Design a binder for this molecule. Structure first.
Ligand SMILES: *C(=O)/C=C/NCC(=O)CCO
Ligand SMILES: *C(=O)/C=C/NCC(=O)CCO
Ligand SMILES: [Cl-]
Ligand SMILES: [Cl-]
Lengths: 247, 246
């Protein structure tokens, strides 16, 4: 039976940087999750670029993305970021969070199929209103940290409603750190700075394959200044280092 | 097809007094560059680099039941302390857990092992001398060029195995991840032999960088365990100077 507990030993990592946020860490073998804040762990926020994980799976499952070697060609038209003005592989597009590449994937998938897959995946509030290519950036789609770790555990076990081949392709594209004892798969997200009363959200979600154990994690925090952005990885990294998972 | 000799990497070898070869191919195994044409095609014991085909064969035959198979340690002494623990497939590959792969090979058996090495065009395909040590001590031999051809087939999912099984092994071979590139690689060491008949050390793999791919295979004569670090530092310095990694 799945369980969750609230911890306090991680609060010092948040208050030291004056951050309002939540970390959820689940140990696969014990089906046990721990968090610094049960209420915020259940609160649903815009997934932003973390939506690229289900978007990639749906793109492959629908055939919009032909295979793992698919190249997304840049047509030479100006893009919002210098980093996106080039041909990208699936891993390249995921690594730099290339919004235009995923906007085009979502358009070819279409609203009917996108809605079907988000329901099969139990992904957040499953609300894709506001436009087929912006409902995850600044739309109505919301997902909690607890829902993110449930979704990533399904992906890890190849239990999503998609071919094992397509789940394996996305799992390898999400590798961000490799060491002899562990492999980190992760994805960042940032909705924007919002306002002082309504700050934006920053995410870091993923999982760590350490020896024979697997740890699923989801971090989110309020962000009103782009200088705080490095904290989306430093806070969860410091917590997982103190737990002996990475480092 | 062609192999072209590149004298600009000799410095990395002579600075360390190493007798070895580096083979580097961009996009495909059609055009490879090397410091030594003769040694690039010379066949050597694969040692732990054989864990790559052994893992694919184990998955294809069902000996390795699935992606998340745990290889339990029975508690009996193993030749290295890092092998005395339960291991995932990636864990067994990354610490080169010989006894895990010896038991996989025994269960695959000589007939199936021969069939797959023929399908994979894996070196001289000689598995004689003992099903649990042919790649460590006997007559199996493969060249640096044949290693890059085999890894290119794996990269393209063109080996005679399911795409699922090739994807499982490719993920188990990831050894370095950066925003710009992903390195898949495997080390090998036959032992020290003698000053006159040295052992061999390997480093083989590929680098997925932006939209480009680079296949590499390194081997060197080795008669002292103190020289093992060179099997990664020499090819690493060559690929860093080529702007592929670092
Ligand atoms: C996914 O997380 C994409 C993020 N793009 C950048 C922003 O959302 C910030 C806008 O200035
Ligand atoms: C993988 O290449 C493992 C190598 N181990 C060392 C030997 O096989 C020789 C001495 O045990
Ligand atoms: Cl991002
Ligand atoms: Cl080795």
């Amino acid at each position: 039976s799945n369980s969750i507990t609230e911890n306090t030993s991680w609060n010092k990592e948040f208050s030291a940087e004056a951050v309002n946020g939540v970390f959820v860490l689940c140990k696969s073998s014990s089906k046990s999750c721990a968090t610094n804040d049960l209420a915020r762990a259940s609160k649903e926020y815009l997934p932003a670029s973390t939506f690229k994980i289900p978007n990639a799976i749906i793109g492959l499952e629908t055939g919009v993305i032909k295979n793992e070697h698919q190249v997304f060609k840049w047509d030479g038209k100006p893009r919002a970021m210098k980093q996106w003005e080039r041909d990208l592989t699936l891993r390249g597009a995921i690594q730099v969070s290339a919004v235009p590449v995923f906007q085009q994937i979502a358009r070819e998938v279409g609203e009917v199929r996108m809605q079907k897959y988000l329901k099969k995946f139990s992904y957040g509030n499953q609300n894709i209103s506001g436009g087929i290519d912006k409902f995850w950036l600044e739309d109505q789609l919301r997902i909690s940290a607890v829902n993110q770790v449930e979704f990533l555990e399904s992906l890890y076990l190849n239990k999503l409603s998609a071919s094992k081949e397509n789940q394996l392709i996305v799992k390898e594209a999400l590798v961000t750190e490799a060491a002899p004892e562990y492999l980190v798969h992760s994805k960042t997200g940032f909705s924007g700075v919002g306002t002082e009363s309504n700050p934006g959200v920053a995410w870091w979600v993923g999982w760590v394959e350490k020896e024979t154990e697997v740890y699923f994690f989801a971090f989110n925090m309020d962000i009103d200044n782009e200088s705080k952005l490095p904290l989306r990885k430093s806070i969860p990294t410091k917590i997982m280092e103190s737990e002996g998972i990475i480092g």
